[PDB]
């Protein structure tokens, strides 16, 4: 008799799981959940004892556009108020290191304009803006179609991407960074791998991989920056499987294939070296999946800015080198830290009896603190001293006694 009652329990749990799947696969529910869970996945991978801080700002993209278009100038936007004004431009305060936006961007004009405003703010405060790109940006329904794309560079020649093309040429593009495929945050519920209490729930992911709780990879990149800073107080080591750009401990999900059993890739696709290189040429930060691991890697962190070409002469090639250095976030971060230190420390020197040569001597002695100009270098020890060379020149603002014009040029390790 009890066998029939157990069959009743099987059918009852079957229907209940039928509805629970509708709840757990709802786009709004997944929006909220993935927001909070990705947030915690970031926070619990940092080290607040290493002088790392994180603030939450609830804002939708539509309202960001509403504020930026309502304000007459970016200096009067609320975001600028709480990023620059209440921080970097406040005596006694502290400057924001970087801004992580949990958003997906398309080629739409609204998204492009939002990116322009974020580039302006990031340039004014010396802090990069990191986000993610949506699959339709490549003209595909989902990232799972990336291996079918024969040529992204040719794809980007269509008139649909005119605004993005100009954005890549703006000088504020150095403060913009967009990531490619998303990444799994939760393994689907199962009586063995992920059980729940009481109700025997077995989550049924259908043919649509959108049933999986995907998460924005911008948070993973943020974890990279956090680790680099926790170890060295600088953020350059975030672009290598051994350098510190490796994301370890990704969720896995083995399930039946065509009679075998295969694992859902933690990222939507398994990006090959050539495809990753193409995305890098297109100014995208692609998190590549280590062929069968739970490990991914960021091979490079190029900004949105496109490098400029110069004449093939000694001076022209020198100009190319400097420009590309500017185009790379791993060096942009050193520049940004330097700007923060300069603002803070110089504020305290305002009022002292400083002549031009005094500025020269003091600034040289200070810059030397982050210079490692030795013989053969503690590999990943020039991490703590990212600079190899540095030059400072100080002139006088003619007709304005007490004011000076300072030029600081740095050669960091490659």
């Amino acid at each position: 008799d009890k066998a029939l009652v157990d069959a009743m329990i099987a059918e009852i749990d079957k229907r209940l799981s039928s509805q629970v799947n509708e709840i757990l696969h709802a786009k709004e529910f997944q929006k909220l959940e993935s927001s909070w869970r990705s947030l915690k996945f970031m926070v619990d991978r940092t080290d607040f004892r290493e002088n790392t801080r994180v603030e939450m700002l609830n804002a939708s993209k539509e309202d960001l556009q509403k504020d930026f278009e309502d304000a007459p100038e970016v200096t009067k936007s609320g975001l600028y108020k709480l990023v620059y004004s209440n921080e970097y431009g406040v005596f006694g305060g502290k400057p924001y290191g970087i801004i992580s936006a949990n958003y997906d961007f398309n080629v739409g004009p609204q998204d492009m304009e939002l990116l322009r405003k974020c580039a302006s703010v990031a340039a004014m405060a010396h802090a990069p803006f990191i986000g993610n790109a949506a699959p339709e940006v490549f003209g595909e329904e989902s990232f799972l179609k990336l291996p079918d794309l024969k040529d992204l560079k040719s794809l980007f020649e269509g008139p649909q991407y005119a605004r993005w093309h100009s954005f890549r040429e703006s000088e504020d593009a150095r403060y913009v960074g967009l990531a490619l495929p998303r990444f799994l945050l939760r393994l689907p519920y199962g009586e063995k791998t992920v059980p729940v209490k009481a109700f025997n729930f077995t989550e049924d992911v259908v043919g649509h991989h959108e049933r999986y709780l995907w998460g924005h990879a911008s948070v993973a990149l943020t974890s990279r920056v956090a680790d680099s800073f926790a170890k060295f107080r600088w953020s350059p080591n975030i672009i290598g499987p051994q350098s510190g750009g490796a994301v370890e401990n990704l969720p896995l999900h083995q399930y039946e294939a065509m009679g075998e059993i295969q694992t859902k890739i933690p990222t939507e696709v398994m990006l090959t070296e050539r495809r990753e290189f193409e995305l890098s040429e297109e100014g995208f930060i692609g998190l590549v999946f280590r062929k069968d691991s739970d490990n991914a890697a960021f091979f490079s962190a190029n900004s949105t800015q496109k490098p400029r070409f110069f004449g093939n002469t000694p001076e022209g090639k020198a100009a190319e080198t400097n420009y590309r250095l500017g185009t790379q976030l791993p060096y942009m971060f050193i520049m940004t830290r330097l700007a923060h230190y300069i603002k803070v420390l110089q504020r305290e020197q305002i009022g002292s009896w400083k002549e031009k040569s005094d500025l020269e001597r003091e600034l040289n002695h200070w810059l030397s603190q982050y210079i490692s100009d030795m013989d053969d270098p503690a590999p990943a020890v020039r991490s703590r001293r990212p600079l190899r060379a540095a030059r400072v020149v100080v002139e006088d603002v003619e007709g304005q006694p007490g004011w000076y014009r300072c030029s600081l040029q740095v050669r960091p390790h490659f």
Partner: protein, 135 residues
């Protein structure tokens, strides 16, 4: 100088009436993340397809509330949706009866208690009563 990051995003189910320059940021750390969730107060009013029957016009509207990440688990989801919580109570009643943990009079009383919920549909009530063994 510390390394301070600003996470900007849609952490709620709706936009706020307060202007962006007026709404304040929240400092988050490992020792108070859950408290930050509870103070932020999460709520989702949404409609999904009602798969508890066989009607394509049947829809189910739910109002879920979140104070911590574990409120995202299916146990909490069921706890917050009476159309499923009643079915979980029915499950417990049937397992208790089949395991001989309670007698038929107690089983009948508790069944009446479960089915008495006025928010349930008569069709759902009939589907639940159809699971009771004849004896």
């Amino acid at each position: 100088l510390p390394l301070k990051v600003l996470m900007l995003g849609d952490f709620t189910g709706q936009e706020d009436a307060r202007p962006l320059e007026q709404r304040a940021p929240i400092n988050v750390d490992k020792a108070n993340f859950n408290e930050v969730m509870a103070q932020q107060n999460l709520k989702v009013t949404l409609t999904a397809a009602d798969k508890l029957s066989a009607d394509p016009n049947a829809t189910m509207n739910v109002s879920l509330q979140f104070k911590n990440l574990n409120d995202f688990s299916p146990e909490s989801v069921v706890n917050q949706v009476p159309e499923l919580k009643k079915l979980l109570e029915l499950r417990s009643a049937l397992n208790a009866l089949k395991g001989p943990l309670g007698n038929l009079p107690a089983f009948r009383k508790k069944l009446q208690a479960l089915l008495a919920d006025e928010d349930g549909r008569k069709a759902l009530i009939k589907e639940l009563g159809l699971t009771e063994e004849t004896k």
